[PDB]
Amino acid sequence: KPLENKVALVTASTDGIGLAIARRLAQDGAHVVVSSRKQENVDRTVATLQGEGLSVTGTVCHVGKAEDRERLVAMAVNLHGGVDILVSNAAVNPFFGNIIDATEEVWDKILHVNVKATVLMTKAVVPEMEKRGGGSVLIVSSVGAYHPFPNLGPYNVSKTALLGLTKNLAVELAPRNIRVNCLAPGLIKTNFSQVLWMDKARKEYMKESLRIRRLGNPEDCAGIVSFLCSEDASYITGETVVVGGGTASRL
Amino acid sequence: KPLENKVALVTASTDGIGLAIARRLAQDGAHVVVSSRKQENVDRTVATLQGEGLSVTGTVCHVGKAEDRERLVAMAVNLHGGVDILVSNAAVNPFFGNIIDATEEVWDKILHVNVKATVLMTKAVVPEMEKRGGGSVLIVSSVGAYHPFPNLGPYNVSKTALLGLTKNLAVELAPRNIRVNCLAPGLIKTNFSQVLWMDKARKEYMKESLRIRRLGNPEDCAGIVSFLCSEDASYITGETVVVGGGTASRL
Amino acid sequence: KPLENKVALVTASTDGIGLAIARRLAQDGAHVVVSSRKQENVDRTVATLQGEGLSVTGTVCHVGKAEDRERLVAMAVNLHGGVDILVSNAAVNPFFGNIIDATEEVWDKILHVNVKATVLMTKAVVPEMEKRGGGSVLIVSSVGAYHPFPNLGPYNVSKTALLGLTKNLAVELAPRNIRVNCLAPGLIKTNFSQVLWMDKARKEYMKESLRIRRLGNPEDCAGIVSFLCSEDASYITGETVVVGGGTASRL
Amino acid sequence: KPLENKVALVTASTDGIGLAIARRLAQDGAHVVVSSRKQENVDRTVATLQGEGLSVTGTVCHVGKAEDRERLVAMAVNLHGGVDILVSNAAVNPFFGNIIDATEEVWDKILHVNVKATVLMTKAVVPEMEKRGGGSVLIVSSVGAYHPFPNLGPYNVSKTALLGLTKNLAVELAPRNIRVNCLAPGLIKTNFSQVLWMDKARKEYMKESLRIRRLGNPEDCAGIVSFLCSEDASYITGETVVVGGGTASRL
Numbered sequence A, B, C, D: 001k002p003l004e005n006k007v008a009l010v011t012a013s014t015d016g017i018g019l020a021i022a023r024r025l026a027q028d029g030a031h032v033v034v035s036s037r038k039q040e041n042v043d044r045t046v047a048t049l050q051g052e053g054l055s056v057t058g059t060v061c062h063v064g065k066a067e068d069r070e071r072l073v074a075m076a077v078n079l080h081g082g083v084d085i086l087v088s089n090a091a092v093n094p095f096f097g098n099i100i101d102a103t104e105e106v107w108d109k110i111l112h113v114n115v116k117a118t119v120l121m122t123k124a125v126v127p128e129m130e131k132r133g134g135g136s137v138l139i140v141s142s143v144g145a146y147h148p149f150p151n152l153g154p155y156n157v158s159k160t161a162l163l164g165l166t167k168n169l170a171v172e173l174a175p176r177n178i179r180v181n182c183l184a185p186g187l188i189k190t191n192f193s194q195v196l197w198m199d200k201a202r203k204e205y206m207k208e209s210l211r212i213r214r215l216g217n218p219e220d221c222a223g224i225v226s227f228l229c230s231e232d233a234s235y236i237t238g239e240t241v242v243v244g245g246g247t248a249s250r251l
């Protein structure tokens, strides 16, 4: 079990990619603390994963709120004695249309949850990882960071920013033995992406436009994340891995 | 005169790269409106460029203020009858240290001026460009967007975000015949960059680390911006050009 | 005349992009030597350009032949006293199909003319540029280097190799004050690309698939090349500029 | 065992990164056929891995020879019934100096072993993978493809070409359900890379120069390759993963 005795936080982990990641980390031996905004979602997720015999607890954490971030870390520290792994997976996107039409308020919300919360969550775990001799951070971006989704401009820009955040954190935290990498999913079937593939007609347009044979599933993302969070990836930092089924990204 | 009869706004154009850009656009035939936060800097710059026989006026514009952005555009419309070119050059960096220590307030200032103000300035000019049958927008990022400068993390992240912003704007404004490109300077001698190349020992270390033969000067950036803002670049959009004297960037 | 008194070689310059580049360099003040494989194509091109008042002469040069390369440089040296600029534009593509079916002989032809000939042509001009205090090399690649064209695999791979060649030459020739940059055209209307945009149905499919408003013309490439070959671009080396009308390339 | 019952070929697998990959694939359940040019090296490697209880056989295969490539595939088919995985790891570099001084003979050798042999090896395995319903190909490039090593220009160019080859093969083989990915190692301690980390002066220098805390070991590359060759990576194709310990690569 590659993550035996490790303690992982996964934000936004009560559905979709975050849940698949949390499940896999726990299957690979970690103690996982799951979280999201709504208590009912946390409760259901914890119950499901505990029912699979996994070492999982959970609490509400809206990543945009400082007190919630601090309480999430405190929970891991108090139940398990520290934190080894952070998977930062939360995102918001309250906008669709031409980028130039997005309001200042839309930009503030997207930049706060998608970019600032990521770095502030990382700041919250770093001192705990230092106590453990190091750790791993994985940030969830998007292939739209490289090749933008039509009509998702502000979101896409926040995801490009995360590419840069990954690189800067990896350089700046290397002296602390903390690795920082990034997952850039393609079109993965989830509630957050659902509108893009709800109609069979829109789904088939997406597949032709993205040049993919199938849509991804949340579990298509879980293996690479578990691997990157493991000591077997000790010479991998500052790296983005695209999980996009062949859709274009970068050289 | 490749920009004869064109009207250009250059933000943050009372020193450094923005001044060199404003000078060159005007030498190339444009009517240029220069601006920055301080009236004395605007006055000095306008006097200098007028004294060189260039068609230049100026006003105060703090790009982070909606009223200032609107008034800048209105000034160009009222004097010259429209706007053809926007060069968005303003940036702030209130931070020098390890990225993990930057507070929410530091992130808010950097993201507001460096990212949000860029898009909101673009939104302010687009309707005027549409009336003219098209236009050119040039956003100033940094080679740090690709290869981060040490101690400059939050700033570097904002500059990466601008690579994304350029791409999204280029796609979305193409139907309106508005091109959007980006200049990514390397180590250029300006007041803003002084900490990096100040002392002889730090300068020699920067040249060896960056693998450059000389530091750049502001005028080294001006020609490409003028070219990109011209109709001779009509099939060039969505592009970032690095002006870095051979320092590393990307394939 | 930004290239007044400069001497330029443009390979493969009797049609298409090469011809547009040669015309523009000469319009901007350079003495240009054009060349290609067939004397008839050379004669037609020299007649046209001399008819426009331009300082152009020509010779046969198949870039894959060492003797031809040597004689081309010697011609420029004899006519004009040296060489300042090399634009390397030749390419071959004897293949249209799935990459897995191309034989060793197809690869040998493509790699020889598209890659080896480029570096060997550069080697031939370097000593002449040294005598002049420096010079400029521009290599013509393709947006297919980043996002491969369908059925053009072996060619696309050669074009990616040229990105690497540009970077390596720019680093290794900087001490000689020789800059090396690359032009990566998108879908430009030429004889070479005819099968891709020929019938109206395939043209509309290419414009949608590439996300462009129009196809490019050879002259759309000429301005950036002239600029990069000028002393106004003295702080630009190791850079690829895509001329693709907003088709996808890279951050 | 993520690769249980799978059959893998790893070229150039009797030392260094190739050996670590072969070892790990076999530890993860695969039947592996190792190979390289010299029978003594093959024998030694097979003996070592068999001694560890791994399902390994070997044969001589100079990847530049068609008959050797054909016979390697045939061996796996005759012993195991098919081929699921190809790891293409062979490389040559008979040159050290300025790229411009590399002769045609040098270029021919590098392009033949490093680029052509890779695609020809892939062609040899594709029909066998089709009989199995799909498969995985992993090409070994280098971080030098993005940021060239000094004095290794022709080699670096060949590695950049492999980034393009990976992308083109991934697109063109997707209809056959064959995934194609690439490993780009950084500074890994091996015989091949010895010149970059000779004595204590050049080792501590290149750590500061490349911005890494340690040199890599061949096993640092093995986990990602095994992962990418597994069905857990079924939504990952056309991807390059850098294993570079924080050395610069790309966004």
Ligand SMILES: NC(=O)c1ccc[n+]([C@@H]2O[C@H](COP(=O)([O-])OP(=O)(O)OC[C@H]3O[C@@H](n4cnc5c(N)ncnc54)[C@H](OP(=O)(O)O)[C@@H]3O)[C@@H](O)[C@H]2O)c1
Pocket: A011, A012, A013, A014, A015, A016, A017, A018, A035, A036, A037, A038, A039, A041, A042, A061, A062, A063, A064, A089, A090, A091, A092, A113, A140, A141, A142, A143, A184, A185, A186, A187, A188, A189, A190, A191, A192, A193
């Ligand atoms: N789906 C795709 O095609 C795809 C593609 C590219 C990128 N992504 C990225 O993948 C990540 C996960 O998205 P997903 O598609 O897997 O979403 P999903 O299935 O819709 O799940 C969203 C999860 O986020 C939680 N959440 C939302 N806002 C939160 C906040 N402020 N703080 C904490 N938790 C929050 C939700 O629970 P609560 O409602 O209880 O808060 C839920 O657990 C995001 O970074 C997204 O940008 C997804």
Ligand SMILES: NC(=O)c1ccc[n+]([C@@H]2O[C@H](COP(=O)([O-])OP(=O)(O)OC[C@H]3O[C@@H](n4cnc5c(N)ncnc54)[C@H](OP(=O)(O)O)[C@@H]3O)[C@@H](O)[C@H]2O)c1
Pocket: B011, B012, B013, B014, B015, B016, B017, B018, B035, B036, B037, B038, B039, B041, B042, B061, B062, B063, B064, B089, B090, B091, B092, B113, B140, B141, B142, B143, B184, B185, B186, B187, B188, B189, B190, B191, B192, B193
């Ligand atoms: N120098 C480098 O090595 C380097 C490298 C990469 C990128 N860049 C980029 O180049 C651009 C220009 O920087 P520089 O180095 O040329 O700077 P500089 O010489 O120090 O000049 C800064 C200019 O910006 C104005 N300014 C500052 N904040 C402003 C605001 N909020 N609104 C409007 N104007 C403002 C200043 O005038 P006031 O004080 O009157 O406002 C002044 O005209 C920036 O985007 C920077 O990030 C520079």
Ligand SMILES: NC(=O)c1ccc[n+]([C@@H]2O[C@H](COP(=O)([O-])OP(=O)(O)OC[C@H]3O[C@@H](n4cnc5c(N)ncnc54)[C@H](OP(=O)(O)O)[C@@H]3O)[C@@H](O)[C@H]2O)c1
Pocket: C011, C012, C013, C014, C015, C016, C017, C018, C035, C036, C037, C038, C039, C041, C042, C061, C062, C063, C064, C089, C090, C091, C092, C113, C140, C141, C142, C143, C184, C185, C186, C187, C188, C189, C190, C191, C192, C193
């Ligand atoms: N057209 C596009 O959409 C496009 C897109 C991406 C890249 N490009 C690149 O642009 C460059 C120019 O191509 P083009 O489309 O402009 O072609 P074009 O209009 O067909 O012109 C081809 C030119 O190359 C010459 N030529 C061919 N083989 C040669 C050789 N071995 N040695 C010397 N000259 C040779 C031809 O003259 P002779 O017959 O007399 O030899 C002719 O002058 C190439 O590098 C190409 O890969 C074009």
Ligand SMILES: NC(=O)c1ccc[n+]([C@@H]2O[C@H](COP(=O)([O-])OP(=O)(O)OC[C@H]3O[C@@H](n4cnc5c(N)ncnc54)[C@H](OP(=O)(O)O)[C@@H]3O)[C@@H](O)[C@H]2O)c1
Pocket: D011, D012, D013, D014, D015, D016, D017, D018, D035, D036, D037, D038, D039, D041, D042, D061, D062, D063, D064, D089, D090, D091, D092, D113, D140, D141, D142, D143, D144, D184, D185, D186, D187, D188, D189, D190, D191, D192, D193
């Ligand atoms: N080490 C690094 O820092 C590093 C960095 C970037 C990339 N790489 C890449 O990693 C890969 C592995 O290199 P390495 O450093 O691990 O090498 P290594 O430890 O020196 O081993 C070289 C292996 O290749 C075999 N070989 C050489 N030429 C061959 C040929 N023509 N056909 C078949 N086998 C051949 C050798 O055995 P025989 O003598 O018996 O043929 C030996 O097994 C290469 O693609 C290399 O470019 C390594």
